[PDB]
Design a protein around this ligand. Structure first.
Ligand code: CDL
Ligand code: CDL
Ligand code: PC7
Ligand code: PC7
Ligand code: PGT
Ligand code: PTY
Ligand code: PTY
Ligand code: 3PH
Ligand code: 8Q1
Lengths: 157, 253, 443, 84, 387, 83, 37, 62
């Protein structure tokens, strides 16, 4: 231990360029170890962009459909397609995305921001109408100014 | 200068404004909204009678606000985690923006204790953190999970305290690493102890109590003398809005 | 009965104490388990040994739940009331105190019930408590909790229609009239075998124990090993042998081969274990197999010898779990490769470990020696070879016991310091009970 | 990187080829619209509209105003997450 | 002489006065209607006869009306109650058809009316599917009633055509494999109508079955389908609404096992315990009591759900219905896993309960705390009580 | 210690995406066809309750062995342009 | 060289102290990765 | 900027603080009526139109 640098937030900052569904580019800052869906929520994106992670014991996690370029395909975390997490991802692809799926389609909670994501450009993918319960649904149209960040709780019930 | 009347308040303009020097008793609310920003709190919260919680504030679970503490959410949002304790006369504020470019809301994780006379402004405090007394954590700074800040310490803006360590000084430097038992049990112990003290205070509170009897006696005496004024506040708010609209229309053309 | 209501209501007052008074919470929860130990000792004082088989009876009308005392229930109740304050000394939260208090109520009422439906209601009402105790969030294992709960539920669900079958057959589930009526013994015998072969770990329905008894905390392991396995034995001795004896004769070759293969295969598995808690956990299966065969022999004084082995196991194996729990609490591992030379660094703990190792291997001056001799007298009187199988395999138990002791106690001294006053007094009542019951057990 | 850097390049050359005021052999994979190819703003807008027609996009006025080169157009199409 | 029909005239006069009172109250701009709800509850008490089942339905509907706030919803629930009450007294297929169709129309309209937010179109979609599926079942009932009427010349419910009427009744209880309308309804429609749908019509239809129905057939394959499909579906579906829909299919399979072996006393005991648990389930604000519903729907011993399952098992073993009983025991072993998932979700978690801001502070703590005392009912359940 | 996820992330994620690039049908067709099947043909099982139990048990095991699961169901016919 | 007791008893936690306190986790083993695997 | 920001903040805080008890109680009753009117199935929504800030009947809708 010596005269080495004091830790700053700028050492742990990750910048991601996000293109929303209107084509507008956005600058999104996050921290290392934070997932991508959390940084998207804290940036101030509307609540129609997000949906529950459809696994058991993880519906309190919000998730988004993102398009990831081929260079950053290998930095998405690995999911066993035979495990229960794999069936959760399969349920999300079956029910939420459907025929908006591309070869670049991932889910934003499965991306953990590190230094390798610095400068990565992603885009928000479209989703189909869905319902979890009466207090959390999506009718299909992204016409709402309510941010996801302003919701005090994520309710599974 | 800024006027003190708001015609676009959610519940309308203020019909009767009382000067503070004309008040004969203390009317300070402990939980109150600022225009359209209402605080959010659970059923088992402890808010001390001389503490102030105003604006856009979210409180969760078994959190507590002790005597004389201020949580002012007027420029941004403040979030207080599950079983997090704000001790006596500590201040939590938030700026509109931070130099790092991140969200400027003050976010406090669960099981976080903040010792007396400490100040948090637009900082990020992760779960299980002890902030010492007379300590300041500035705008955009980050305190990581399972870490301890010694008393009378300054964390300058956009600075970071790494996880699992004890830091202290002005400016804050490395002191030592926490033991594994300290990270496993002691931080939760401090948070649980202060929650137990808050529960002891919560059990003995008679709300709303009986201090209103004197003020009601004075109002009864005014009704006896015929000097109590009955004001139709809804109709006065309606008429004031109509007059404001007419005055706005009678100047553009 | 009035006393039992008062003890329950005194025990349940732990929740109403404000949590900021730490000393009062500790003292109240410890005294709430000390008092039933005094009451059960008084019940032993009140017992007439030249009187009736069932004494101190009480029946609560038409609600089932009828109670009475015999020798097996009384000895097991004394052992449970000893074991529960030691569990109170190993917990730190009000949630733990309340879970163990509810468990003590259910165990004590289940040990002396005389109604089969009452036994069903009282025993497996502890299932959700065991699930929460084993699958606790940061340091438990949800897989183990799922295994123990699902195996117990499977056995209980096999029993429940046969219980109701004899209830419709004769009109009651009271064991005094179930033993005197004509019933279809094959069906009810299969239901009772299904519950009690899961409670007692008998192969093949035994795989829940190695996961659950290791994933549990030290207090949970003390309770599960020393108490809850013996509910299968008292199930055999109180309900199955008196009510379906024709089945109990006809199933004897099958129960006999299950006991023999459980003993041999579980002893062979214990030798390859590399976890100290898993070593202690497997050794209990062979002892319970000897208990079950001694119960089913029905030959000389079979209830006496089998109850005495249940008491000797319930004294010796919780102490081994306590020593492993000390090592885990102050070294954060249960792995044999991390421990060596514990004689030089914990001389008192290693001495206690050696004495309880010798006790677990049924050496003399321990109650296990008298127990295994009398159990083999009961087994020998049916046939000599069924005794010979247990006699010749004694080298296999001593192999794992001395190998585990020699690997962790001798060698290069590394590991934690010696025991504290609190750890010594958690161990101490079991040692005094062992010395008494192994030297002068009777008068 | 949402799409490859070769097929987009030859598609760019293919739609640059059919311009009457351009030279079918002077077009290079890395050139300029102003100094090299000799185009004013309206010709640039026409070329960007042809690129939009071929790749099925919508490029706003500021983004198309920033595009001044063949390499700039290829990089903008490659960076676009909604390309075809 | 019409002197034996004053309760019917009272029903009609009360409806005529209640509509006019609701009109007068709305002409004043009243944004709350607790006075209308009290008059509705009084009308419910005043039209109900002095039988056990009739008053069980009456008290249930009085409790249910505290979760409904508009005038039209209260009117629809009253006119659904008329069908629910008079179906228990129906001794023909004429009144049976009219009562069932009134109930179906009321449920469809309420599903359309009460939806709000982003879930409005999902609720309307599920209501349309339910209406279309209900129309063809109503057509099957009418067609086979016409067949029976032509064959017998009378209104007796005898012969081979009663098998299709039985299938109509099994549709109305959500019995698998005709179960998916209820699964669709559980995923979108709000909690108050889900509370209404799981309690009152099952009571009404089972009382009609107990009172005036005989068939010469079996329902065993539908017992097997309901129990296995409900248990496996609730094991496999991560959304909680679908979990409770499939667990409801499992419970109706157990009630059908009680019907099939005769012995309606165990049916009535299990149905009452289930209805009280439903009243607790859909009015919960503190999530720790969600674990009590879990341990009392898994049949765990000291709580009342154990007793409700265990008399069904006892009477099934009494008449030696061995194969259906074995299937029921296997599905009971499976049900414990997802009720433990419920306990993992809502008991081993930090406690957060938001306070009220616009008044009405935790407005149904009385009913939920009263229904949690299903741990004290087992003392009365062990006795010969329900017979 | 944590176990390693088996496989490659790109290959696993392509396996997760497979056969779901299609609009899901509404459930009204499945529900209507189930109700038609029960209301038209469930009377064929009326005499089956009196058949010997070996036949009934083997038939139940046969129905379990030939059952195809509705969840995660996919056909190759969904993505081909000719039979 | 920590001081966790006053001269008249009275345990002190030493939360903000520089010296490392001796406690329950003082003798926890250093994990070998291959043994854990 | 800091001085101007606190001038703007002190205006809003003085506006909230200097309301009488009668105004605050009337505002709580208005908040209650507004939350009762947030139900789209409320039976008054088909006849009356309500003022947003006071929850009074402004006009007939039909
Ligand atoms: C004519 C017009 C045509 C219309 C056709 C309509 C079809 C529409 C599609 C549809 O219905 O959707 C499927 C739909 C799916 O149901 P769902 O509501 O979406 O979901 C429910 C579940 O979640 C189901 O979830 P899932 O489908 O997604 O799958 C999850 C899976 C998950 O499964 C599991 O994980 C559980 C598996 C447990 C063990 C696993 C094996 C491990 C063993 C270890 C290995 C050792 C080797 C052992 C080998 C095997 C030994 C066991 O579950 C299963 O596979 C089990 C479900 C099977 C139900 C069985 C109940 C039937 C009666 C009970 C007796 C038989 C049961 C077997 C037991 C007896 C054995 C002796 O199924 C139904 O609704 C059932 C009805 C369909 C069947 C009949 C169709 C009627 C048409 C009649 C034809 C003409 C008339 C002739 C018959 C006369 C009248 C009856
Ligand atoms: C001739 C027939 C006369 C009318 C009979 C039917 C109408 C009953 C409606 C009723 O009791 O209105 C509640 C109403 C209280 O409502 P509220 O205080 O305006 O509302 C406050 C909130 O609900 C928050 O307060 P809360 O939720 O704590 O209280 C709600 C309410 C009732 O809350 C409940 O619904 C839960 C109570 C569970 C007990 C259910 C009993 C059934 C037991 C079956 C035994 C056979 O509280 C009571 O228990 C009041 C009972 C008064 C006597 C009932 C007779 O009680 C009364 O004002 C007295 C009504 C009695 C006749 C006049
Ligand atoms: C089936 C018979 C029961 C035997 C079970 C084995 C008991 C284990 C220890 C053997 C002690 C023998 C004691 C003999 C004299 C005591 C009184 C007596 O007679 O025993 C009672 C019951 O005895 C007991 O309850 C013995 C209690 C033993 C439990 C000891 C373990 C608990 C102590 C733990 C350590 C405490 C240390 C604390 C100090 C710090 C009745 O048994 P029987 O004589 O068979 O009954 C006669 C039958 N009939 C009425 C029909 C004529
Ligand atoms: C709490 C209020 C609701 C309780 C309803 C319980 C229904 C059944 C649920 C599953 C059974 C769980 C029983 C565990 C009992 C022991 C226990 O842990 O008690 C609790 C409290 O349990 C009780 O309610 C005790 C009183 C009921 C039993 C005794 C009286 C009746 C006999 C101690 O407090 P904590 O666990 O720290 O509480 C924190 C809650 N949470 C887990 C959600 C973070
Ligand atoms: C639901 C309630 C909870 C679960 C049911 C609990 C049932 C009560 C416990 C068992 C009651 C019988 C105790 C054993 C016994 O022999 O009792 C007799 C002797 O009384 C005792 O000495 C009882 C001692 C009670 C404690 C000993 C352990 C038994 C169960 C413990 C329950 C409480 C444990 C608290 C742990 C924290 C009866 O005395 P009596 O005068 O009522 O009967 C005589 C005559 O027939 C008149 O009726
Ligand atoms: C305190 C609860 C919380 C407060 C909230 C209240 C909830 C609303 C009211 C309860 C709703 C559930 C009731 C369900 C219906 C059960 C009663 C049906 C009738 C029944 O069982 O049959 C009668 C037995 O009555 C009986 O005596 C049946 C005993 C009770 C059964 C319910 C068990 C669970 C409790 C026998 O009828 P009979 O022989 O006289 O008929 C011959 C003439 N047709
Ligand atoms: C299933 C649950 C039990 C688990 C273990 C079952 C093992 C098989 C039973 C062996 C019984 C002995 C035996 O073979 O005797 C039989 C006695 O009949 C009988 O009386 C058969 C009763 C056997 C089943 C009783 C178990 C019921 C437990 C509760 C089940 C749930 C409710 C009921 C579905 C018929 O002798 P044999 O034909 O070999 O003789 C040949 C000369 N004739
Ligand atoms: C703890 C559980 C307490 C439940 C109380 C059960 C009381 C049953 C009374 C029945 C009776 O006397 O009949 C009155 C009466 C029949 O006798 P009647 O007055 O001669 O017609 O019927 C009723 O009013 C039945 C009341 C049913 C209440 C709902 C069902 C249980 C909840
Ligand atoms: C359906 C068809 C209907 C069509 C009707 C619409 C027709 C509208 C035409 C009338 C609008 C005009 O001419 S607008 C008048 C355009 N002329 C000017 O503004 C004077 C300055 N010269 C320029 O701007 C030149 O474009 C240039 C030197 C190339 C600048 O080079 P760049 O470009 O690099 O910038």
């Amino acid at each position: 231990h010596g005269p080495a640098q004091t830790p700053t937030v700028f050492d742990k900052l990750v910048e991601v360029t996000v293109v929303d569904m209107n084509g507008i580019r956005h600058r999104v800052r996050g921290l290392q170890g934070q997932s991508l869906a959390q940084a998207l929520v804290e940036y101030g994106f509307p609540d129609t962009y997000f949906f529950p992670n459809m696994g058991f014991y993880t519906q309190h996690i919000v998730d988004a459909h993102v398009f990831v370029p081929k260079e950053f395909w290998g930095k998405v975390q690995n999911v066993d397609p035979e495990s229960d997490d794999g069936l959760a991802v399969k349920r999300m692809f079956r029910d939420i995305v459907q025929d908006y799926q591309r070869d670049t389609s991932f889910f934003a909670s499965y991306i953990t921001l590190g230094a390798e994501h610095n400068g990565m450009t992603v885009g928000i993918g479209p989703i189909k109408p869905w319902i979890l319960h009466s207090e959390w649904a999506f009718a299909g149209v992204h016409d709402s100014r309510n941010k996801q960040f302003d919701k005090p709780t994520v309710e599974i019930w | 200068g800024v006027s003190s009347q708001f015609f676009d308040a959610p519940n309308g303009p203020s019909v009767k404004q009382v000067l503070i020097e004309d008040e004969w008793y203390n009317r300070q609310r402990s939980i109150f909204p600022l225009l359209d920003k209402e605080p959010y709190y659970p059923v088992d919260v402890f808010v001390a009678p001389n503490a102030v919680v105003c604006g856009d504030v979210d409180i969760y679970g078994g959190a507590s606000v002790f005597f004389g503490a201020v949580l002012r959410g007027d420029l941004n949002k403040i979030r207080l985690g599950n079983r997090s304790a704000i001790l006596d006369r500590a201040v939590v504020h938030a700026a509109r923006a931070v130099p790092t470019g991140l969200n400027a809301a003050t976010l406090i994780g669960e099981k976080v204790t903040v010792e007396p006379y400490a100040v948090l402004r637009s900082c990020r405090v992760e779960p299980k953190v002890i902030i010492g007394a007379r300590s300041v954590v500035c705008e955009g700074a980050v305190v990581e999970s399972e870490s301890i800040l010694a008393p009378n310490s300054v964390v300058p803006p956009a600075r970071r305290i790494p996880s699992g360590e004890l830091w202290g000084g002005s400016p804050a430097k490395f002191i030592r690493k926490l033991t594994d038992h300290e990270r496993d049990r002691v931080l939760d112990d401090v948070s649980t102890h202060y929650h137990n003290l808050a529960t002891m205070f919560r059990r003995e509170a008679l709300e709303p109590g009986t201090a209103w009897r004197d003020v009601e006696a004075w109002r009864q005496k005014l009704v006896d003398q015929g000097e109590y004024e009955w004001i139709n506040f809804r109709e006065q708010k309606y008429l004031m809005r109509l007059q404001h609209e007419a005055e706005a229309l009678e100047k553009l053309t | 009965m009035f006393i039992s209501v008062l003890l329950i209501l005194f025990a349940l007052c732990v929740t109403l104490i404000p949590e900021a008074h730490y000393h009062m919470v500790r003292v109240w929860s410890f005294v709430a388990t000390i008092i039933p130990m005094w009451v059960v000792t008084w019940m032993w004082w009140n017992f007439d040994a030249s009187g009736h088989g069932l004494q101190m009876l009480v029946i609560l009308g038409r609600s089932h739940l009828a109670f009475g005392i015999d020798g097996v229930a009384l000895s097991l109740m004394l052992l449970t009331t000893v074991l529960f304050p030691i569990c109170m000394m190993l917990l730190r939260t009000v949630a733990g105190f309340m879970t163990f208090i509810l468990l003590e109520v259910l165990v004590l009422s289940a040990l002396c019930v005389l109604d089969l439906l009452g036994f069903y209601i009282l025993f497996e009402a502890s299932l959700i408590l065991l699930f929460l105790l084993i699958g606790r969030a940061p340091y438990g294992s949800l897989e183990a909790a799922y295994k123990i709960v699902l195996y117990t539920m499977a056995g209980s669900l096999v029993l429940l229609p046969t219980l109701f079958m004899i209830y419709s057959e004769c009109g009651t589930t009271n064991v005094l009239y179930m033993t005197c009526a004509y019933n279809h013994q094959t069906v009810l015998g299969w239901g009772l075998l299904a519950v009690l072969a899961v409670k007692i770990p008998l192969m093949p329905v035994h795989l829940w124990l190695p996961e659950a008894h290791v994933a549990a905390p030290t207090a949970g392991s003390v309770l599960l090993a020393g108490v809850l396995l013996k509910l299968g034995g008292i199930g055999f001795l109180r309900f199955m042998l008196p009510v379906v004896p024709e089945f109990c004769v006809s199933v004897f070759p099958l129960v006999s081969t299950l006991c023999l293969v459980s003993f041999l295969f579980s002893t062979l598995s214990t030798l390859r274990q590399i976890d100290l808690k898993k070593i202690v956990a497997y050794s209990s299966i062979a002892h319970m197999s000897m208990v079950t065969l001694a119960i089913f022999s029905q030959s000389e004084f079979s209830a006496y010898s089998s109850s005495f082995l249940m008491i000797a196991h319930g004294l010796i194996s919780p102490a081994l779990f306590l020593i492993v729990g000390i090592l885990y609490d102050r070294a954060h591992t249960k792995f044999i490769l991390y421990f060596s030379g514990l004689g030089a660094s914990m001389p008192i703990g290693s001495t206690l470990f050696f004495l309880f190792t010798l006790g677990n291997l049924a050496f003399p001056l321990f109650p296990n020696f008298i127990a295994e001799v009398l159990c083999m007298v009961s087994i020998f009187a049916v046939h000599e070879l069924l005794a010979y199988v247990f006699c010749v395999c004694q080298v296999l138990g001593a192999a794992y016991g001395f190998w585990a002791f020699n690997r962790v106690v001798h060698g290069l001294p590394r590991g934690p310091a010696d025991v504290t006053r609190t750890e010594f007094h958690t161990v101490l009542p079991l040692l005094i009970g062992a010395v008494w019951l192994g030297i002068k057990p009777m008068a | 990187g949402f799409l490859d850097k070769d097929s987009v390049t030859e598609r760019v050359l293919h739609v640059t080829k059919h311009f009457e005021k351009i030279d079918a052999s002077k077009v290079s994979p890395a050139a300029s619209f102003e100094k090299d190819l000799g185009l004013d703003s309206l010709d640039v807008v026409e070329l960007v509209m042809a690129l939009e027609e071929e790749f099925g996009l919508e490029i706003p006025d500021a983004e198309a105003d920033k595009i001044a080169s063949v390499g700039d157009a290829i990089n903008y199409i490659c960076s676009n997450p909604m390309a075809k | 002489a019409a002197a034996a029909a004053m309760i019917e005239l009272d029903l009609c006069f009360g409806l005529l006065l209640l509509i006019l009172f609701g009109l007068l109250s709305l002409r004043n701009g009243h944004v709350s209607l607790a006075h209308i709800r009290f008059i509705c509850q009084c009308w419910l008490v005043m039209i109900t006869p002095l039988e056990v089942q009739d008053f069980a339905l009456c008290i249930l509907t009085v409790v249910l009306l505290q979760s409904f706030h508009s005038f039209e919803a209260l009117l629809f629930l009253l006119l659904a109650y008329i069908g629910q009450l008079y179906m228990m007294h129906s001794c023909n297929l004429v009144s049976f058809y009219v009562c069932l169709e009134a109930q179906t129309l009321c449920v469809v309209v309420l599903c359309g009316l009460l939806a709000r937010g982003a879930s409005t179109s999902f609720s309307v979609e599920a209501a349309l599917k339910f209406l279309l599926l209900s129309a063809m079942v109503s057509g099957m009932a009418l067609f086979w009633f016409s067949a029976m009427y032509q064959r017998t010349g009378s209104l007796d419910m005898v012969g081979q055509e009663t098998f299709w009427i039985l299938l109509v009744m099994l549709f109305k209880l959500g019995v698998a494999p005709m179960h998916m309308w209820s699964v669709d309804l559980y995923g979108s429609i709000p909690k108050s109508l889900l509370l209404y749908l799981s309690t009152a019509p099952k009571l009404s239809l089972f009382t009609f079955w107990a009172s005036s129905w005989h068939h010469d057939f079996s329902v065993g394959v539908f017992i097997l389908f309901s129990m296995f499909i409900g248990s496996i579906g609730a094991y496999g579906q991560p959304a909680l609404r679908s979990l409770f829909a499939y667990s409801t299919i499992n419970e109706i399979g157990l009630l059908l096992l009680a019907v099939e072996t005769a012995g309606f006393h165990t049916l009535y005991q299990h149905l009452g315990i289930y209805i009280i648990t439903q009243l607790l389930l859909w009015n919960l604000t503190d999530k720790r009591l969600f674990a009590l519903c879990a341990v009392s729907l898994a049949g765990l011993p000291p709580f009342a759900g154990f007793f409700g399952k265990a008399w069904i098992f006892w009477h099934a073993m009494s008449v030696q219905a061995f194969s259906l009983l074995a299937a029921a025991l296997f599905c009971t072993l499976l049900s414990l896993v997802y009720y433990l998932r419920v306990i993992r979700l809502f008991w081993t978690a930090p406690v957060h309960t938001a306070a009220s801001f616009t008044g009405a502070p935790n407005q149904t703590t009385l009913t939920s705390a009263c229904a949690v005392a299903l741990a004290f009912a087992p003392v009365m359940l062990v006795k010969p009580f329900v017979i | 210690y944590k176990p390693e996820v088996p496989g490659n992330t790109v290959d696993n994620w392509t396996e997760l995406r497979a056969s779901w690039n299609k609009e899901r049908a509404s459930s009204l067709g499945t529900n209507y066809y189930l109700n038609v099947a029960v209301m038209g043909f469930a009377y064929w099982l009326n005499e089956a309750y009196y058949f010997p139990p070996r036949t009934l048990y083997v038939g139940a095991l046969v129905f379990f062995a030939l059952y195809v699961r509705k969840a995660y169901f996919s056909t190759p016919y969904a993505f081909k342009h000719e039979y | 060289e920590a001081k966790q007791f006053t001269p008249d008893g009275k345990y002190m936690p030493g939360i903000f102290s520089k010296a490392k306190p001796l406690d329950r986790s003082t003798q926890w083993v250093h994990k070998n990765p291959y043994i854990e695997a | 900027k800091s001085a101007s920001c606190y001038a703007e903040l002190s205006a809003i805080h003085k506006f909230e603080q200097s309301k009488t008890f009668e105004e605050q109680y009337t505002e709580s009753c208005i908040i209650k009526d507004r939350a009762a009117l947030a139900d789209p199935s409320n039976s008054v929504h088909q006849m009356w139109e309500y003022d947003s800030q006071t929850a009074l009947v402004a006009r007939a809708k039909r």
